[PDB]
Subunit: 495 residues, 4 copies
């Protein structure tokens, strides 16, 4: 009787269970949903698949979904972010089937995702079937689904494996990213097992809730091109998520990540924060809090002025690359820090990325620079030395998100706010499942939760911090044209 979950160690379960209980002290949003909905079980019968950093905080999310009645299969959306003790808790209590561990190979990542997406047909002659709902962080669960369908249609056309899957090259001629090569390797394997797999999932698939900015961007592109195959909810852009998680969460988790990976003192150092959006604002605020001299880079004139108003210098990377001490990428873009920028940096300069993917820093070009010399400084920290100048740079966790790679990500309070939106999004998608009609080619769309619910998430966490909310009088409520119980701001308010 072997277990189907693949994790590091099951005996670490008890530590994970005690950390979940401690975290729950601050996660009053998820604690309230469990208290309120565990009897009625609003998600009963739902098969949920999650692709999201399996941390302690996430384990409480999965438990919340379980207590509400869903069967769950889960994996991580990054090779370095899983907390093995959190994973073990879920498996020990039989809360969810898990395919996740810390320090996975890229190939392991894609097999764990595919397995998480695979469901056995219960009492209907066991064969392949998919999930009903998806919890996604970065869009990888959503991508494999879409790329699977695309690969299957292309397969029937010529009745053979599509040429783009087998090849290692791309449209241009350069080497494909390891992430793509492994994803294609898995799709090719599934075409040989069963070429109707991905399209078979669509009939019982009712929606996906996306957690982060980069995943939402991917979802919006598909929506405008009319290629979105399931309804979706943008959890990232809820006020109680983007204004707290992205900003305040990072203020603390970036520092935790830098302290663990970088041995140096952040005070007095020139630290460049590339991108001054919701994540960058938080990164800059924490770095200043500990004495760093932050220097910002931006493409957006509005964001540039905001950094300027907070006392920060705004330069282009090329003018400070030789004097700066530390570089933190928070743009969600690609090739922000190139091999050529890295060759100009000072001795032992530190490079980190807090964006979702490792495309911001050119890690592939760094690792494959002719005659590069690399050494492990500690777990998930590497020093690269160029052969011509003999100068080095220290990269934190191969360009993957530093707060989750070298630390544990955001703390429970802000995660409960993000995850309360997730549960509320999952319920909305599940309760609406009847409107999803697969007959007429009705395009699928991306929507946000109501402001009513967004304020509700905030109300659920006021007691954690001993916040005493003032209440409006009928006259006051009428004077500012709002209901005593809200909402209190118009739909375009920016907080």
């Amino acid at each position: 009787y072997k277990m189907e979950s693949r994790i590091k160690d099951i005996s670490l379960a008890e530590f994970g269970l005690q950390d979940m209980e401690i975290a729950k002290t601050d996660m009053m949003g998820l604690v309230e949903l469990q208290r309120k909905y565990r009897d009625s079980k609003p998600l009963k019968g739902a098969r949920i698949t999650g692709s999201l950093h399996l941390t302690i905080e996430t384990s409480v999310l999965v438990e919340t979904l379980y207590e509400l009645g869903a069967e769950i299969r889960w994996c991580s959306c990054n090779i370095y972010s899983t907390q093995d003790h959190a994973a073990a808790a879920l498996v020990k209590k039989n809360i969810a089937t898990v395919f996740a561990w810390k320090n996975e190979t890229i190939e392991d990542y894609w097999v764990c995702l595919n397995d998480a997406m695979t469901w056995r047909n219960p009492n209907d002659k066991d064969k392949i079937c998919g999930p009903n709902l998806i919890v996604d962080d970065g869009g990888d669960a959503t991508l494999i689904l879409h790329e699977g369908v695309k690969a299957e249609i292309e397969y029937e056309k010529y009745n053979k494996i599509p040429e783009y899957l087998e090849t290692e090259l791309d449209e241009n001629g350069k080497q494909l990213s390891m992430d793509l090569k492994c994803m294609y390797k898995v799709l090719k394997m599934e075409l040989l097992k069963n070429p109707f797999r991905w399209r078979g999932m669509l009939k019982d698939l009712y929606g996906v809730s996306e957690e982060t900015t980069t995943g939402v961007l991917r979802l919006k592109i598909m929506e405008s091109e009319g290629k979105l195959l399931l309804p979706a909810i943008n959890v990232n852009d809820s006020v109680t998520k983007s204004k707290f998680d992205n900003t305040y969460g990072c203020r603390q988790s970036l520092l935790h990540g830098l302290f663990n990976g970088c041995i140096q003192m952040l005070a007095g150092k020139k630290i460049v924060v590339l991108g001054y959006g919701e994540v960058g604002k938080g990164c800059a605020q924490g770095l200043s809090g500990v004495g760093a001299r932050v220097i910002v880079t931006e493409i957006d004139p509005i964001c540039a002025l905001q950094a300027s108003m907070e006392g920060y210098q705004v330069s282009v990377l090329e003018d400070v690359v030789s004097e700066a001490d530390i570089f933190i990428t928070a743009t969600g873009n690609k090739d922000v820090i190139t091999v050529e920028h890295m060759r100009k940096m000072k001795e032992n300069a530190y490079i980190a990325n807090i964006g979702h993917f490792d495309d911001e820093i050119d890690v592939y070009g760094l690792e494959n620079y002719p005659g590069i010399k690399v050494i492990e400084v500690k777990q998930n920290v590497h020093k690269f030395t160029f052969p011509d100048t003999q100068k080095s740079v220290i990269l934190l966790c191969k360009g993957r998100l530093v707060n989750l790679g070298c630390a544990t990500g955001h703390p429970p309070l802000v995660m409960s706010m993000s995850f309360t939106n997730q549960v509320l999004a999952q319920m909305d998608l599940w309760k609406s499942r009847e409107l999803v009609d697969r007959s007429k080619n009705t395009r699928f769309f991306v929507k946000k939760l109501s402001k009513e619910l967004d304020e509700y998430v905030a109300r659920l966490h006021l007691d954690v911090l001993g916040i005493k909310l003032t209440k409006l009088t009928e006259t006051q409520a009428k004077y500012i044209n709002v209901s005593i119980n809200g909402p209190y701001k118009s739909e375009d308010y920016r907080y």
Copy 2:
């Protein structure tokens, strides 16, 4: 009070003219618009009436509108905000016809507004006509126009002066505010002169651009009930206005206000910021900057958490009113500090308002409290002593916006940003005047400026602060799905 300005002292012109030139160093947005459009003159022929705090920064606005071809008549939107040397400058160099001075009585304020609205067309027998466009701040120019129209329709329904314009009481038997009585006093006088005055203005009236949150509130109410009789542009909600003027403007001008009117040290004091919106955030940020212990009051749970995340205590006024030292209202609401709260305050507590109207603090109840003792500490600073406790509270400029009442308001940089949106809004309203056809549509809506123009306002002020903007490469532009030249964010982005 016809075509000859009415100011305090013309001899102050040279000081006003030199401060304008110094201010222009940072008001690059307005400087660029003058350089760009003074030849073509897009506003040529427009009669503009402005109701906005007549400061040095506003003079540059009026100059800009004048250089673009407009004829202008201006007044202030507050009895204490006018800067007499700024008003003289406009009159001396003959840029506009001004009706404003510092420390006006409420009676004269409404006369000044009514005078700025009155024009004499020299082509059609020198008859009384109205303005083509209105620059409003607080919605008073818009209010007198709409109330005037309702007064004329009510005047013809019975062929007599309506009862509400003569009585000093409202529907509940309470005394009407001096501002309503003084406005009704003007409307009555205009019904006797010409009962078709306000309805006559509407024919040539093509728009209004509103500056502040409180004015937009009034516009939204009218709009939703189909009572807005002219097109409107909401300048307040432009990113380059709301997130800079409201927040960073107050961060500096609140302190200037308190330093001039309040003699005590702010460091270590418990200062209560009521409302943690865009103005409140800036207030708290400035106060903390000089060592104060800020305590926040809120009705909005999201804003309450935002305050909490910045390390601020969030309480209801009743729990801290006895121990707190200073009180700052920034809600844009009414009855936030009642007489009963003022009686519980400690000896020499200071009270100030930074919202647009004096309604936040019950100033009328305090001044008319039986046996109240009142003395002038300095110009626009009064100490009120209650007879039963012998305790005193010190009120800054009778509850009117303290930054403009006790000091000179926000500095030129953010006002240039706020005023670059104003000029662009006037040009929009004027260029699209042909689309206003009253034989078809008499009810209008409020719109905001595009994000293209919003980002443009920001480009114009980058060089002021030595800001270096990064430029996206084609690959980066394509990867994040935006144009190299912008816009760089989606319409729902909150910056």
Copy 3:
């Protein structure tokens, strides 16, 4: 009243009202008045004061008055006097005042001289001096020493000394107007009575110095063996230097910048020259409103401290063309020269917060050939160079900006500084029998840590502070008394 020279006596009512409001936070002075107004430990003492006559200073004068002293006062700067504060004192016959806002440099020295002059009680109509001096900057102390030096040189040759009658100095450089007018007053007094200043030594028992610059002048006199009276360094009390110098300026520099400079401080590059106690406060306040502070320093320890607070530390010559605003806080000379001013960007603002105007080369700027000056507003001037046609805006002619363009530090910190002043005066007065002028060099000393802690205790209730009390076991473990002192003499706080 009769003697006094002030602007307007009608402003007295507003001054008295401000004093009462200020007293809410100045619990130190209020307490000293409550406790010592009956016994009057300073009764019969004649006290002369040279210190920025502000509302806060009027409460100090009122306190010294309630404790029994007879007072004559003047300001230590030509722009810092608050006319309503000086009126309040005259109207209540608390002191004979010689001070007004916007004095000429010449009148400044005539006021100080008048403050130092006292008619001999009811004995006759002969002139004598003060028993005690309250000084800020060292000018009251300087005129006494230069007056004695001038009288000795007078009797040695039986004529006026040549150095008092010349307008050029050592290397043919024009003398500062402050020396010009001081020597002018000294020459006038040698003609009326060549024993005036030396006669004041007989009854002069001490001086209490308020600021860092004045203290430097005292220690130089002490080390050269030329100090003619005992002195107390009030500036170096923990309750003065750690609060007045730092947190005082954090608020009052901003007040002054907001009144003189119309521009927004957010995002601007503001150079703070000197990162001492005043510099630290300046930087903290500037950052609080979004400025990007750049620091200059000579001390590598203070430079590293600046670096730890996230500030860029540079030499002025590398940032003078790009910086927007300049704040000198070194207490040194020629920190900003005319050459530096010519490299500055159009409409760059320059200001000083140190005690004297010497930090900026104002005289060189005003006298630059072809220079064109215009008055922007009260005590704010725009200077324009003839060759480049570029301009710089100087605040209140290089004199201390917080008191020049605004009203100085708030009451709370001044109370801490002035409670130390009153305590210094009481000390000097109680030891007047030990001053024997017929044997002895005088020394500069400081108040004890006990009195330093006492000053702090007197201001805790203002801010609602709840102090913890050590148990006997804890007091023994950390080796202190329950009632203090809690730190060693070398503790830096």
Copy 4:
């Protein structure tokens, strides 16, 4: 004896690589090696060190070694050792080490005693002592003095003193575990040789103390006339106290809390007890990440300073129930008692950043009748009272949290503190001839000059790209100083 006692020698390679990376910011120690490795001013000196064996400490040890010293070392806390750092020293034969993370209190004093034990081979293998001591907290100095004191008492009545063979103190109260284990070692040494400690005095030339608590101990001995060797107070150097104690903690406290405490610090009411040099840095760090800092103080001067930074100042009793996290930074005892802990809210965190664990009543907590304890993770324990069922979470049994749950201060500030240490060691060695034992003379505690203090700041300016301005002839004369310093009077507080 002769060989080291450490966790794992294979960790040495990681230790050496972290040392090399740390040297980028420790230009004080790098400059001292460059300058003095050839002349070797410490040549022949035997040095025993009791100081947290971290990577930063390993560079200190390496510096003393490059200057010609023979070294024996141990940690000054049971949880502060970094095993890779300890192993790096043993691999290069830089020193003989007795230290590892998670020592039992017994093993602590045994290691310290071993580090003090020198095998002089020029006398056919016979025991002697060190020439110089580098100390942090005063334990090396404590075992020396108490050792001497025990031998004098032993020799008086010719038997083992009864105060060493007992669980009780002067008033029948149980002795701290550290005293019993120290005494257990002192008794052992009386049995082997009752002249051991007094024999060390002959060649012992001095001690350089790192921290505030150890300095307090030294000053008490000085005033009572019981100090047995010259001492140099390194804590009170300006380049130590104003940087290490304040800015070091600003970062290392947050690192410790982040590793030990899973919760978000933003919006929480965090109580910082003591607003001294350490308290100031802690509060500054906590505010930086959005916490609401509440301060407790006994000193009204320090209380007003807190108030000037916008912090509420309260007595612990009025906030113990509502506060979320408690950080002791007083250097005192019984600042947080069992009775305070019983009133705290569910899952309140408690930590100490003072040198010793006495600030929190840990012994009382662990021995409370019916208390239930569980290990949450490495060095983090949750205690649950049986009557209320409420729990408190203690970080690393009340020991300095920055070094116990994290890796202490970063290299830059430690280089400043340790550059002072080396200079203090060189001073004590240079002046060894002035120590005349054959007289019974009083020994004093002295501080390094302001000249060498400014010198330490100069050696680190380049690390952060600081361009220092230089005084002109006229300016120097105006402020009455030399162009090359010192620039401040001795009483200046920075």
